[PDB]
Amino acid sequence: FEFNIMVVGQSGLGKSTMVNTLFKSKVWKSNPPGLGVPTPQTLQLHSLTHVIEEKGVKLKLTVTDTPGFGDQINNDNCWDPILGYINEQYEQYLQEEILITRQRHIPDTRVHCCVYFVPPTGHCLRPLDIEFLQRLCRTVNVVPVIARADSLTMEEREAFRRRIQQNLRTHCIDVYPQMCNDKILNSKLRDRIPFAVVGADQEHLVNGRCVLGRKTKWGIIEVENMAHCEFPLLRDLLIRSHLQDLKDITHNIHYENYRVIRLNESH
Ligand SMILES: Nc1nc2c(ncn2[C@@H]2O[C@H](COP(=O)(O)OP(=O)(O)NP(=O)(O)O)[C@@H](O)[C@H]2O)c(=O)[nH]1
Ligand SMILES: [Mg+2]
């Protein structure tokens, strides 16, 4: 039924474009029309909702788009609006439970997974992103990705991925899937995280087939082709393979911890 995700990261990393790519993926039975217009810089936090379907199963997918950070001289406390929105949904869910005349089914607007966009510098994790991820992973599931990965070669993607994984362990950033016998499947996923993804809101004719891609002066970058980028790995993780596992952790771990602290401090 319901599933909510949110894109977070530095400004100019294709977060808004990735929102359109998730809804326009050719895996679903139908897609919204092609955009064909430059998306302006996101100034306000806003959520998009649409019902997608695959294999006859409908899903009410909600994606929250956020304004990018990291453009000021001093970016201190730039995580407050995003952390505030995450806790706002936990408070809404709690107030719906304690309502004396509460409805049968509680509307769930809690963020079930956060997609964190990392700049494709090719070096290591930035101190600004380290501070952001450490605060994020305490309250929400986080899956990091290498944004606009076509700016790096395949060799550069892998070397950058390994260096990101090194300082993730060094700074104790437990991203999803957390380490807490199917370890072989999650080890394969943790090997590829952060995914090297590419966004696209346009359809192009390549090899006689209509596919999503970015048209440049040298070729078409097919975003749903594993030979070009790893967007199918992110799409299958969020929507297909680990959808319920993300919701179970959000309700039983993250929201439960928020609810316990809220009720204990009120006696
Ligand atoms: N090379 C490349 N460019 C991309 C990709 N995705 C988006 N872009 C381009 O990058 C620019 C910024 O896109 P946008 O989605 O607005 O970024 P944003 O993170 O939403 N910015 P903001 O957070 O400030 O709103 C646009 O020109 C867009 O076409 C990608 O995968 N690769
Ligand atoms: Mg944007």
Residue numbers in the entry: 48 to 227, 233 to 319
Study authors write:
Septins are GTP-binding proteins that are involved in important cellular processes such as cytokinesis, membrane trafficking and microtubule dynamics. Many of these biological functions are dependent on the intrinsic ability of septins to spontaneously polymerize into filaments, which subsequently assemble into higher order structures such as rings and networks that are capable of membrane association. Human septins 3, 9 and 12 are the only members of a specific subgroup of septins that display several unusual features, including the absence of a C-terminal coiled coil. This particular subgroup (the SEPT3 septins) are present in rod-like octameric protofilaments but are lacking in similar hexameric assemblies, which only contain representatives of the three remaining subgroups.
Two structures were obtained in the presence of GMPPNP (in space groups P1 and C2221 at 1.8 and 2.12 Å resolution, respectively) and one with GDP (in space group P1 at 2.19 Å resolution). Both of the P1 structures are isomorphous and have four monomers in the asymmetric unit, whereas the C2221 structure has only one. In structures that contain the GTP analogue the γ-phosphate is anchored by the Mg2+ ion, one water molecule and Ser58 and Lys62 from the P-loop, Thr89 from switch I and Gly115 from switch II. Arg195 replaces the lysine which is normally present, but its side chain continues to pack against the guanine base in a similar fashion. Furthermore, Phe116 (the homologue of Phe128 in SEPT3) is always observed in the buried conformation. Both SEPT12G–GDP and SEPT12G–GMPPNP (space group P1) form filaments within the crystal lattice, employing the NC and G interfaces. In contrast, SEPT12G–GMPPNP (space group C2221) does not. Rather, the monomer of the asymmetric unit forms a G-interface dimer by the application of crystallo­graphic symmetry but this does not extend into filaments via NC interfaces. For this reason, all future discussion will refer to the P1 structure. For example, a unique feature of SEPT12 is the presence of an Arg in the well conserved G4 motif, which becomes 194ARAD197 instead of AKAD as observed in all other human septins. The side chain of Arg195 stacks over one side of the guanine base together with Arg266 on the other side.
